[PDB]
Amino acid sequence: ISNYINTIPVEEQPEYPGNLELERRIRSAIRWNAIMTVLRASKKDLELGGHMASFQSSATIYDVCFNHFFRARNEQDGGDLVYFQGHISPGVYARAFLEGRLTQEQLDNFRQEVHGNGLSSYPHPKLMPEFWQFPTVSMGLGPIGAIYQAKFLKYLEHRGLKDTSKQTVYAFLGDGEMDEPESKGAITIATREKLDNLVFVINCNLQRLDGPVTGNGKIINELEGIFEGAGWNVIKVMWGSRWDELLRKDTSGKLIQLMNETVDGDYQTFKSKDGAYVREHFFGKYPETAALVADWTDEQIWALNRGGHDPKKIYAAFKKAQETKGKATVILAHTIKGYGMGDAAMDGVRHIRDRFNVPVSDADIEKLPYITFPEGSEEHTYLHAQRQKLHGYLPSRQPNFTEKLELPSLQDFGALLEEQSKEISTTIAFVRALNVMLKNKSIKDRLVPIIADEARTFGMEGLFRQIGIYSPEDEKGQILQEGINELGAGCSWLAAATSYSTNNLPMIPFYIYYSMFGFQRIGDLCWAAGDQQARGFLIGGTSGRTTLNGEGLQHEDGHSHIQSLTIPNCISYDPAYAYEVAVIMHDGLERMYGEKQENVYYYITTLNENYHMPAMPEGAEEGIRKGIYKLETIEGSKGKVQLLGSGSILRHVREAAEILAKDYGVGSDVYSVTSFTELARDGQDCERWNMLHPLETPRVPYIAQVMNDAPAVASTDYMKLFAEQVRTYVPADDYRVLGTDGFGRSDSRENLRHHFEVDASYVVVAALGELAKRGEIDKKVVADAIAKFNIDADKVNPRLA
Amino acid sequence: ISNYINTIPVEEQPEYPGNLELERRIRSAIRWNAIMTVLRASKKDLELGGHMASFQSSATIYDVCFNHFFRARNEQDGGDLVYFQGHISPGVYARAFLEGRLTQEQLDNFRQEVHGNGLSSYPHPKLMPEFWQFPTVSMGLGPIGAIYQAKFLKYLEHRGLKDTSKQTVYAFLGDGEMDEPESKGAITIATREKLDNLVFVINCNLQRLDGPVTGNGKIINELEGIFEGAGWNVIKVMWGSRWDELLRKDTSGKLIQLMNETVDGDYQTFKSKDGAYVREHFFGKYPETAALVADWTDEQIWALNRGGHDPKKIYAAFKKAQETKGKATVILAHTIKGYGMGDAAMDGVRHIRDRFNVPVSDADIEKLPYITFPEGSEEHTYLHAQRQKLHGYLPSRQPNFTEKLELPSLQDFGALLEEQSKEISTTIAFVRALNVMLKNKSIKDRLVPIIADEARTFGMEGLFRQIGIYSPEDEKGQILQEGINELGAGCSWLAAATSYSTNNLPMIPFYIYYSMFGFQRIGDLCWAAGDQQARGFLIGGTSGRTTLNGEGLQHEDGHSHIQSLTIPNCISYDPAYAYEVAVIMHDGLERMYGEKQENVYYYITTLNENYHMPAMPEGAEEGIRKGIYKLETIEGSKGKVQLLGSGSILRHVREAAEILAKDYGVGSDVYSVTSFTELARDGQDCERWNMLHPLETPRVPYIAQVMNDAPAVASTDYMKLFAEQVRTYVPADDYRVLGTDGFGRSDSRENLRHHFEVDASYVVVAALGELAKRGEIDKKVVADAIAKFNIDADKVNPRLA
């Protein structure tokens, strides 16, 4: 911790390069337009919401950056990647309007987007695909997202894929937001990886929403203490220019002592009072500090301002950051929340128009008019001139990449479509599939395999040799080993998965990890990734409740597919065989990185269990993509059922089919369900459309074009809801679903599959019971199966075990 | 960052209080048994798994704590709260066996728990309720959980509820695990709250699972740097006692220097070579260093050990931690992963036996025998004596609290059961219910309201005047204000929700926050809370996709219920009315904290929208708790349907019922569904039971007892699956479900409810559609309803919008 004053003394401060007077004029119009946008919205009385106090506190910080630092996307790179603090969006909209990028109508449609000519409350690429870039309103994600984005830019340079040396990643953070663990939890990575292309800008207004961040402490010193300790370059922007003479003339050092000892709570109390109060309670603390302003008026004392509101102090900080190498920089900008808003914290607008000398008549002021600068005016000219010098306007977003990739054909995965020699797992199939992609000229080096420590568990260790591990194992290494850090790996994945948009350089990441620690652990990032239109693959390894058998409660995943189906643009699959994994990976590659450029990302659960991998049935490709296909039908003259399975449990459902046929004379149609969720969505879309077009030919759910009406049983390694979700669309009156509801526990696969009532025995009993209800076999046969199979009909429901 | 030597020089090192040689005899048996447990499991060839290398590196650290520090649960307090690193569990089981707390048959069932006499892979209270206390195997949750547990202990002392001053919270962490953002992201909280009852014990073996944490750096210095920066007391336990004469003998300071410049990777390299390669590639760096070991044998060099393996060095650290006040302490213990396992990390077993002088003869070694110390032996005597002086054995867990609470009756919530004069929301209902609880003598001071910054948004402000904010606004304050930190808040909620077990002191937490930032953001902690048998309330405020209308994509929650239903022991509700909220909160209170002591926690989504709140219908209580009740029946002669709604959307389904009756003569039964998830679980249980008891009369799902066969339509503020999950159990041929699938966006509630196709007009069209299909009405009237209601039949599916 250093003294509570500016890091950069005035004698080391560079001359300000812009026109302060003209800049303030434009900045005041932006402040005004932002407040008009939100006030106009609130007048509608539709609970639209919106904030003003935060942007008022950081407007000058953004202004200096827009006028002198921010590079826009250009022909060479995506420009500076700015993670705009979410709730200051009105200020960004206000500037964009001023630059003629948005119409008044749009501002008048702030927070009213459904009908198409409105603006989102916050940065949401999915809602405004040509405008916003990084979803930041869920606090804490921006900081860690920014760290891994800066690290990815370095990666692209080190790998010789793109020169990104001219890009800087700015993460605009709140001080209260720094309390989210995700906020400082990975700051150490920036020092490890020497991220001198990263600048954290923390708006230290000392307040969060309902009160001070740490009233009895000094948040700025806390921030400086931990960032410095983590090895970052810390630049404090504490006091404005009026304080300089004061600090210089004070030979006693008491003013510094006084600033050091005063806590946040008191500094906040001062700004809520007046000049006389500050003279008595702050300077009045010591005779020497009292003497420094004895000859000042109370009004002159009240003029003293925080550093984050002084363009000269701000510039000094951003320029210094720009020259700092070998590590990242954090700028702690001291501001006043609700700056210039008066008592507020219908003439409160009058106060604001007076305070910022806004050019709005006391006559028109009732109309909450927006201010624009006409073409040819000083303001208009300067505004655009500064932006053109920095390559244009930002934020801006390109929705599709321009180059054409020569993707592998499904035939290139031919080896995986044949029966496999040895028993292997779908995870081994995944690695084999990746190897096929790594032989493809067009995308081999665009692939970004990502792992969170665990590689050996996934048989990925065979790649540490072939393509190497990134380590600026050298800087040309291709694999990203992020350690025990799922959120960090997900942030690398996200940066890679959106490179097609931000850098017009499509990269195809495959992040494989323990499925349990996917959506459950980084779900807020998975949602944000959907918002950011990520295109990549999330491979949930060691998946299935009963399949990662020895690991237990906190590892046995029988529900990640329930979490993943809540993300609209995530496409999820639970393949049982190697050929399915290949057809799915190929399809995903084609949809996301082929000419379609579909904005979706994939989720594929894979397994750590080896078993026989048969050849793909001729023509089953499309059915695998759609979510289901008939594997075979076994004959039997005593009855007929339908049996569905997915993932590791399918082979057990097939075992049940053979038992039903040979022991009971019951034939069956056996289906592999590669994606219950895609089938459910398809069924939902068909019935929605049918409800809306009552006079037309009703659409038939895909699952109904595959299944028939005989009694059906489904079993998977996931909770029942995974397979039950398609009930409405299954065309049979009986559809029984077995699943792994309940907490996991350690045991053999055999014991867990019996415990969770999903093994072949339970599928047979479920099928026989349906026949028995139809009077096709004696109920005693079902009772006898239960006993023969050692099934305990009265053990507690696994959900409650 | 200090020199790469012990923080506590030998001159300030207290005399070790124990019998080193005897403790080693005991420790060697624990080491042996842990290994035997894992090897015997491996022999079964059931992919059970388990670890050995990690515990071998930290065994002595734990051993010193078990002999001289760890306080067991006693009559005064719950003892020290030890968050044992998850994968060192075999060592804990080995010691417990040696203490006679576990049997040999239990060790032989390591990782086979289904049949009842086994041991979980890791610390899972849900699976071993009388043994484990804290779920730590999901890395990163242990450290932040421990920080807030330590804070909660202080809270209990300041509130005057329990004297926890003698309790220390120990978090045993791995160095690789420190990369999890949750691991270091909340550490400044320990400094703000002066948590001198918290000790972080980081096993710095320089390795994670697939390689070194940071081979090109020095993870110990990185850790010291940031913890020191966060205000913690850092104690580095670097070198064993053999280095003391050496470090002192060096006058050039070349050794200190040599130690400072060597990177993690080099150090790991050395421990795989031998004294030879060490006296040359480490000591043979500077003539002054290689000269210190001039008169030394390559064997005496190879003898130099890391501090984490020397009990004298370990004791000093823990003793210094125990004495420290005003801040938390972190101990960085330098160890060797796979310590003493030689060759590897019957020949390897022979090596272990010899290396640690294990009392196992050549004749018995092939049987992989466990060792025990007979009563009367020195080892047995010492083992138990040390533990008795420390109040007993740990870990151990008490599943139920002993005191009897006098809970408020449902009558005490009478005002909430009546028709409300003022239009209010379910969130206002929750705050009022809390207030009722706050007037109950027995539980008023056991309630723990928790907020993450936002209180004003939730109308929680009126409570500050009543009970205040915990702020050591004073240390008697009842409300926990955790700032912008949902994970921290969840950890405080967990600490409070499990106080009933940990301190035999029931505390009832109510954590209210934006629902979107619940399971989605802290889902891994929620799962873990289930494992920890948490009994508390999670209130997802501002819930529903269309109800928090202006906030948009990262705020509009139409899926938290899909995430919460994956947790077995979480009970979820989405009430529409104030009376339902009171009935739900009363029942949860009774279930969890009444005599039943059910191990579940509640999740209730509440709304920010005000509307008319009717009186609870006579006798609806049981239906409200079970999940559904028939609100009303509307007469009609043209047809009849059933309409279901929950949350804020029920109001609209009720309006659709009026329209159906007024404009189309269609009558209906209207049901409020307070919990689609509890109904689906009930349905699954009935079907599971019916399948398992084919000779019995089929049980009928509650929802089917309540409903009839008339065409049904359901609408909610969540994705369709929320209501579709009960499809199988709805006894009607048609069950259409409207829901809010798709990303949220900003707009008026009216525009979003139309966009997401869940408003009254869509319910009416859905119902007419079913009647037309049945022939009751003409399809043409369905078509005319669509145009009449300004419904765009061809707009894109909201899931895709």
Ligand SMILES: COP(=O)(O)[C@](C)(O)c1sc(CCOP(=O)(O)OP(=O)(O)O)c(C)[n+]1Cc1cnc(C)nc1N
């Ligand atoms: C819906 O509007 P809101 O509640 O005002 C909003 C914008 O959603 C905010 S703003 C806010 C306080 C921000 O305080 P900071 O000091 O970080 O920023 P500022 O002082 O405003 O510059 C919080 C906690 N949240 C809520 C919040 C909480 N948790 C997460 C993960 N994200 C949030 N964004």
Ligand SMILES: COP(=O)(O)[C@](C)(O)c1sc(CCOP(=O)(O)OP(=O)(O)O)c(C)[n+]1Cc1cnc(C)nc1N
């Ligand atoms: C299946 O067992 P496993 O992989 O050996 C296990 C126990 O599951 C572990 S152990 C482990 C490495 C531990 O490294 P540390 O340096 O922290 O500890 P140690 O060196 O062993 O003392 C990881 C990443 N995981 C996996 C892991 C990853 N991510 C989370 C959130 N939790 C985990 N626990």
Ligand SMILES: [Mg+2]
């Ligand atoms: Mg702030």
Ligand SMILES: [Mg+2]
């Ligand atoms: Mg380690």
